[PDB]
Structures are given as structure tokens and as C-alpha cells.
Design a protein around this nucleic acid. Sequence first.
RNA 1: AGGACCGAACCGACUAAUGUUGAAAAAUUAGCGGAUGACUUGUGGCUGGGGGUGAAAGGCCAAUCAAACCGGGAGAUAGCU
RNA 2: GCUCGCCGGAAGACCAAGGGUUCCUGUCCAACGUUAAUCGGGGCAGGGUGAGUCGACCCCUAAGGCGAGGCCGAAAGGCGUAGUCGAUGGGAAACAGGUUAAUAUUCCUGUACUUGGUGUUACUGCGAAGGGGGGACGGAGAAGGCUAUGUUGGCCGGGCGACGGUUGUCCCGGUUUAAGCGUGUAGGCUGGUUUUCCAGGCAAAUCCGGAAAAUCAAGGCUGAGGCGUGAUGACGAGGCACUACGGUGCUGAAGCAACAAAUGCCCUGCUUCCAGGAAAAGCCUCUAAGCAUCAGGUAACAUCAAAUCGUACCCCAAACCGACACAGGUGGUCAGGUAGAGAAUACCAAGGCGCUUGAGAGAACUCGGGUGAAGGAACUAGGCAAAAUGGUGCCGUAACUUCGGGAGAAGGCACGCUGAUAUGUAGGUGAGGUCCCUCGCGGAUGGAGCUGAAAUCAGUCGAAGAUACCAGCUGGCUGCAACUGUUUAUUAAAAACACAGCACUGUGCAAACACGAAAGUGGACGUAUACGGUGUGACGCCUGCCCGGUGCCGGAAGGUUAAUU
RNA 3: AAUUCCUUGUCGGGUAAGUUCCGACCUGCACGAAUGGCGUAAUGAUGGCCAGGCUGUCUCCACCCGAGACUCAGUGAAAUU
Lengths: 271, 46
Amino acid sequence: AVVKCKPTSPGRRHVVKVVNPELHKGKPFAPLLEKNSKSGGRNNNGRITTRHIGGGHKQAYRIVDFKRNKDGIPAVVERLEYDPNRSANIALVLYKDGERRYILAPKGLKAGDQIQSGVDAAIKPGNTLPMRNIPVGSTVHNVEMKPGKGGQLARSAGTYVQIVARDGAYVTLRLRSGEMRKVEADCRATLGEVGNAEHMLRVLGKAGAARWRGVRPTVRGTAMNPVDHPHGGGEGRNFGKHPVTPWGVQTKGKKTRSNKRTDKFIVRRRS
Amino acid sequence: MKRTFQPSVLKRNRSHGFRARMATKNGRQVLARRRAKGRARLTVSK
RNA sequence: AGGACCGAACCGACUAAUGUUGAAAAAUUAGCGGAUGACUUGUGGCUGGGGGUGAAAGGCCAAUCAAACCGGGAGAUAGCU
RNA sequence: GCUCGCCGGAAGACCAAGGGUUCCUGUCCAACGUUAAUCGGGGCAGGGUGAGUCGACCCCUAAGGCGAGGCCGAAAGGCGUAGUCGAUGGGAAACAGGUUAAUAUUCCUGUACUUGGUGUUACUGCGAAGGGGGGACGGAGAAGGCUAUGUUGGCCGGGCGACGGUUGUCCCGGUUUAAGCGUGUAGGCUGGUUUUCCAGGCAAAUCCGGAAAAUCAAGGCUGAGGCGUGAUGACGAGGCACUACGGUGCUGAAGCAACAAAUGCCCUGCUUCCAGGAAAAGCCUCUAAGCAUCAGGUAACAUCAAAUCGUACCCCAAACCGACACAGGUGGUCAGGUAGAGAAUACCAAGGCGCUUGAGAGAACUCGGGUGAAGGAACUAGGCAAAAUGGUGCCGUAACUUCGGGAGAAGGCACGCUGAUAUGUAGGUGAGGUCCCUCGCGGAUGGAGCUGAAAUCAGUCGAAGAUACCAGCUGGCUGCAACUGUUUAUUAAAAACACAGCACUGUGCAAACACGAAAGUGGACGUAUACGGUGUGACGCCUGCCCGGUGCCGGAAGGUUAAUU
RNA sequence: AAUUCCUUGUCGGGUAAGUUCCGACCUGCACGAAUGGCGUAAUGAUGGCCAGGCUGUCUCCACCCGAGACUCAGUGAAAUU
């Protein structure tokens, strides 16, 4: 649910929390945990390659099964768990053979609901089948882009895609960005939508909340000196130049897609 | 007031020690120059 | 419950006086701010000079910074003293 | 040596880091010490650091480093796999007393413990670079049970007072004892045991996981402290023979109870919250390839081994970092009494110090303070500075507001001591006794003793009772920024920088973008409710007109247009 | 007006007297709507202004307690020339 904190002090007036009582109130599944060391936005050269990254709460990675290649073995959801590594929630599923795994939580999946994967699975939220067997027009998520490598599209809090067409060898999809992309009719996709829709309604409410997430403050660029940024300089607030990145790129319309390697799976990029 | 030099034997040897000098081509050139000059103490090892 | 309140440790440095060949190449004294947090601290590690890092002052990078330090080109050049 | 003064959450005690003999004894006083010096962290000489249990080494790994091959790069070299290093983290075991001029959990006395090797005996499925378990983990809060420790009483020893009183409800001191072993309590967690089956745990598995039955409800694990033992011992205030008044043998009384009580322990617990909280080994199990009247494994006993290095001394400082015997800086541990909410503050204990020139004088002036007639901001750029307010309880408290605030608004009243209510109350603690029992560290009743606020009434002293230290000035109007934060180390702390929020724009994942001649890495083990960049800067009401210019995003007929031919 | 040159604009409030301050006026030299406009409770070692209290800030300084200054003994600098 969405709850507005009372303004008992500054920094709590505008805080809006996403309280989900169904989430497990305990430790996660240890066998599916892994170490996850923070990088601070620095690469193997020790240089900051991405700015505004640093600090934050310690996190342990959860091994999430994005492939869903266990076909023909029914599984039952055990509980919903909070995952700090992603906006969506994860669910612990127990298979009939005794194997446990983590999957992205669909919209209306609770504890005790059954899921299945493969070509013979039924059309139910949480089930994963190749898009060839998925009826056209249905809503899916965690869509594979190449057969067997695991889902890569529609993995955020409340994202999803729609299968609009099926040429027979390729299936066209409408991504959350409005792009009309097509992939092979063998890429597994999961029925339903990732269920954390209320994620976008959260309001951090204060600077410290962002720092908990590991986001460091952003310095505009007009506030710097010309030696530091193209926007820097001026006696007061001048900014008499076209908006531009550091390193000198537009940032106000200039398209940067220069892949050209695919250039066939894209149809209606967006807008 | 805190001054610039805060001694630490472990950091002294890891930064300027004999093995650190020998681990890099330029470091070995430092030893060669000091040997040519006749330095009694090549490094800060002890 | 709280980047909540008062206030020691702890971390800061708003005002005044003293000091200014100082006790001290920035401190002392009386007050002052934060003090469960975007906090503070020990140990070790990583980022190297047109580069680093920077809640951005051209700040900081060994008392040195609008381009560190050491050696070399080098007895640079100086229509100037 | 006797007084005086100062610190006492240190200016005491113990360490790490760092230093490296500054430690102890004898001797010397040139230089060093801001003076003298017989003295010293100075000179010279000698002496001093004793470990299976403390630390290192060692086993294990984090960030990160290196890196066989490998990938990449004019050379140098870069990155990185298998691996191998790397603590600031995990991993076996010793306590008390005594002792040296200088070391001790290291020596001695007493009493313990741990991990291995070998051998004997009995019983035996043992076996790994593999599987599983465990190790193994956040913030805040809440009590409850304890101990360290303290106070008082009792007990024991001593004392009878330089000046009135002091044989008593008087005064001083002591009343200490560990690890280990046994007991397994307050309390925490978890339903047990047996059989059968199985797409999982890279193969296997009796182990883990999963499924289905049967059978009992009491099983197990964790666990401070207490009690017993350790201890017929040790220590012990003071005495008695020696006694160079420097000190040693022997002897040595009491050694209990109650109450208070931690920030320490139970607690790696419990409750709760979102920001969702290391790894690996040791350790416990599982079997594979293999080895099977072997080898190995379990238990008992015996025996042997546990090396090597550090150990002095300073360590908030005269020994470390600051050129100094320098008002500086420097992480961890210990935490007594009275008053107090308190680790504030005042005065003290243990302990340690008076800060390495003194002696006089009592001018101006400077520095740091005290007081002040009448006036009370007339000072001044400016109430700069100073003065002032200052505590607890009760009463009371405006505009405005985002309904939380504003607010401790403002303002007013009461505070000491003595007695009584009550020879010490409410409350807390809790003995004996009785009763119960699966009799145990048990339950109920029981209330002795101990401890002990707060309030009312009455009386009483002073100018003054929150008397000292300690300890908010308050209110009205207004600019700027919402706010907590951040910044020019060393003249600027701000209206600047961040900020949550908002918007535009890029980005379909081998993402954009960034660091890299490249490989590759970050972005991200993320996937458009995501990520990068830019501007704006909580919230409220809003954000109008202009696309000629410049930029950006599209367009296709035409014109012009490079290499090439 | 953190923006207004003329300028101490004009009027009103506050003062015995107000180039500052507060409220209006609009002749905006040269405001203006995300390089945001206008409001805004709370917050601020932030800027301006006015009160009560308070005082040696002052009229106008006086005295006193300490450390120097001064004298004696010991040690013994400096800039400059």
C-alpha cells in the first residue's frame, strides 16, 4: 500500500512509503545468496566511469532464475521476498523434485499459487512458455531476446510487453518504451506483469534517502568553472551556450544510437 | 595539528620497499641509479 | 518513529580578545554549531599531473596548485635591470 | 622528612601505532638541560626482555595486488583465467598467589587445560580438490534476570583522645580468594521418533531437500549468574624473634549478611523497521573413484612433542608526528566516594604532580579579572564587548500554520532546615515459618529485616534556600534560501553547493555514456516504474506571446559537392 | 526591489529629530514567469530594523586582585647597519 508519513519533522513531510505486508519478514534463502561488492562507479583502471555512484547500504545478491528452463516440473510459490538489487519483488518457488529458485514476482502471484514452464504449460500468470506458444495480444514479461539466455526485457517494477504480431519466424513486441521490436518465435516469456506497480509512487522525501540507495549528489555544471565543464563560468548565472554534456554532446535532442549491427528488429523506435 | 608524516612500517615497505622497487621496470632503474651513485642504503627496507 | 529536541565525549570553526622575531609556519582563552546520522573514527586498499578527486571554492592531490614533485633537454630565451 | 597547593572520565593505570635501550645500578658534570646542578630521557661502564596456553609465525579468506597459459598492444607493456598473496575479520588451550634494583598469565608454588605424533588394547566401514549443514553477520527500541562495583550493618583487631565533651546510637582499619571441574537455573529457539517413496544438490549418497503414512506428547539445542569443589590452601589488618632502621623467617584474628547497581554479561537473544545487512577455512555430516581376515575410523590408557620470533621502557607524551625537554596532533581498554539526570560540574580516594631561571619592588602602560555613585546605548559602521537570562514542579501561553508546529512562546507561583502525619509513609527488596511437589537452583502463602521517594501541615534561621560550580535573554516587523546538510586546510560558512520534488532529452541491452591505441572494465550480475546527461530546486497557486536567428529533430524534388573513373 | 541612475522619489508609520527600516503609490533609467514568477508554516552561529531587560559601550572614568613592565643575580637573541 501507499502511506503518507505524518510531518512530525522536516524530512518526513513528503516521505511516501510503499508498505507491502505480504513480503517475507525474515532472512532470505541462504543457498541462493552471493557476495556483491560495491564499485563506486569505478572500473578496473580505478577511474570514475559513471558519476553519482557511491555509498549506500550493504546488499547481498539474490540468484534469480531468468531462464526458467525447468520444464514439466510444477512449482509452488513459498513466499514473496524483498530484493534490494532490483525494483521488483522476488518469489521463492519450490519444485516438486525439491529444488528451490528465485523468480520475479508477477502482478497477482501469492504464496501457494502454482507455476509451470515449458511448451505444455497453461496460460496463467507466472508461467513461462516460448512466445511461439503464447497467444498473440497477451501480456508477458521477462522476455528472452535470444533463445536460452534468459529474460532481459520487462524486468522492472510494473513493466510488461504486448505481443502484437507473429510472422511465424519472428514475433513483434511493444516494449514499455513504445518501441516495436521483434524477436524470434522461440524466446521464452512469462505471462503477466511484474507486480510492484506502486513502486513508482514512492517519494524519498529527503536527501539522505537517496544516499541510502547509493546515489551521490549531482553537481549541475553551470555551478562549476569553465576548466571543469562547458557550462562553467560567468559573473553570476550566465549560461549563454547550447546545453551539452561534459565532454561536449548536445543532451537536448541529439540521438546517440549508432549501433547499426541489428537495424532490423527495430520498427517504431518510439514517439 | 596533524602533520603530513604519519609513520607506518607496513605502508613504508609496501610503497618504497626493496621488493616493491624490484617489482617494476622503473623501480629497478631506481635501484640501478642508486647503486651507480654508491648509496649505502638502497631503499627503506630496514 | 525521527537527516526530531536539550546537552558531554566525539567531529566542527560563527564572534571577540590575545598572540603576530608567537607556546604554535593558524594556536590559546571565553562564548558558538552538529552531536542516530548526507554522522564520526582505526587499519589496509584504489584513483597520478592537462591527469586524479571535487554536495563545485579553481578547492584538494605530503606546510608547494589557473596544471604537484624530482631529474633531464639546460648555460631555454631575456631588444630588460 | 613535615606541611601547603594542583589533576583525579586524568595531569591516574594498561596497550596498539611509532620510537629503538630512552629501562635498572654504579660512576662523571666539559658539552646537552633556555639558570645552578651533587640531578637527568646527558657522558661512560655493567646489568636487564625466560611462554605448548599472550602476540607474531601459522590455517582461512575481504577490498585489493600479483598472475602459468591466455587475450591485447610499435617496444616498454595492459588486462585477466587456473592459481597465489593480502587483516583492519574467522580458526585449539592458564588462572590465582609469590618473587627481581630492573622481566613475568613467560620464572617459582598450587591447581588446570588444548592440539598433534607413536605404541598397546577393545570395537569397527574407512576414504575427496566433490555434496550438504554450520561458521554467518543490519539499524533502532524494549524491558526482565545478573555480575563488576558501591553503601550500611554484623564480625574481628586497635583506639579512649594536645582544647569543652567523647565506655557509646562513639572513632580507625580489615572483612580478600581465580581458572578449571561438577551442577544446568532466570531465560531464548525448535514439535519429536519410526517406516516407505522421489524429475533436485554436475556422478554417487544412509547426508540435505521434497512427498505420503504411522506413533507419543515430552525431545533436544543454546544459556548469564548462583551454588559446590578448587581452598585443612593462598592472602590477610597487626604482632613476635632477627632487625646495617635497607629489610627477612615463623606466626597471623575476622574473612559474613542485607541493600543499591551498571553503558558490562545473558543477548550473535527478543520486539520492530526499511535503507534488507562479508567471504573462506577450522568444525559436523555424506558418500565417489579406491582400499577390505589390510589400511583407516571411534574410545580408553601409556608415552612423546608443541619449534621459531616478539616480550626492556615511553606510549594524550620530555621517548611517537610537529627543526625544540614546543600551551598543538595521536586509536583502543580500565571507570572509586559525596552532591548530581549524567562519562557535565565542584570537592576528594587510589595514584600522580607543582609544569627546569629565581629574588625583590608594588610607577606609567599592556594583558587576564573583581567592584562601582547618578544616568542607562547618550557608545559605535553595528549593543562589538560586557552585563543579563539560566534548574525542577504546577499554573498559564498570541498571531500564523503544511495542523506536526509556533512553544521552554510570553507570564505567574512554590523551592532551605526541623518535627509530625509515619519512633521511616507509598513503593521496592525479601528471611524464617507454614503448605504443596514430577523434592528442585521448585510453586504458593508468609511477612521479619533492609532500602526508600514524594506530598500536606506546623515550626524555624538568613538580606538572600534552583544560595557555590553548573545553568535558555525575550518579544515585534522584514529580505534571502524551504528544511538537516556541504564549501575556499591557513582572512569569505553565505543569499553559493547539495537536497527531496519537477521537467526536457538520450538510451532495446554487446544500451546510451565513461576509462582505455586494444583487449577489457565500469554502467549492471541492472533491463525503460531502468540508466546517463541537462536545467529547475520542498510545498501552494501557476508557468503567458515569438521558430526570423543559432542548435536540435525530420523531409525529399532540385541545385552545388570529395576520393575514385 | 539583493534589481530604481535621477534619489535621502512621494505619502503614511515609528523618533524631540530616521539617506536605514516598515506599509502604500508606479514615473519598472534597466522585474517577470523552470538560467522559473508570486506566496509560504517551520528552520538559520544568515542580511536589515524596532522594543523590554541589562549593563563601564558611553557621559567620565575611580579603585582593587593577579601576570608583565621596573631593580638585583644567572643565561642570553633578533630585524637593521
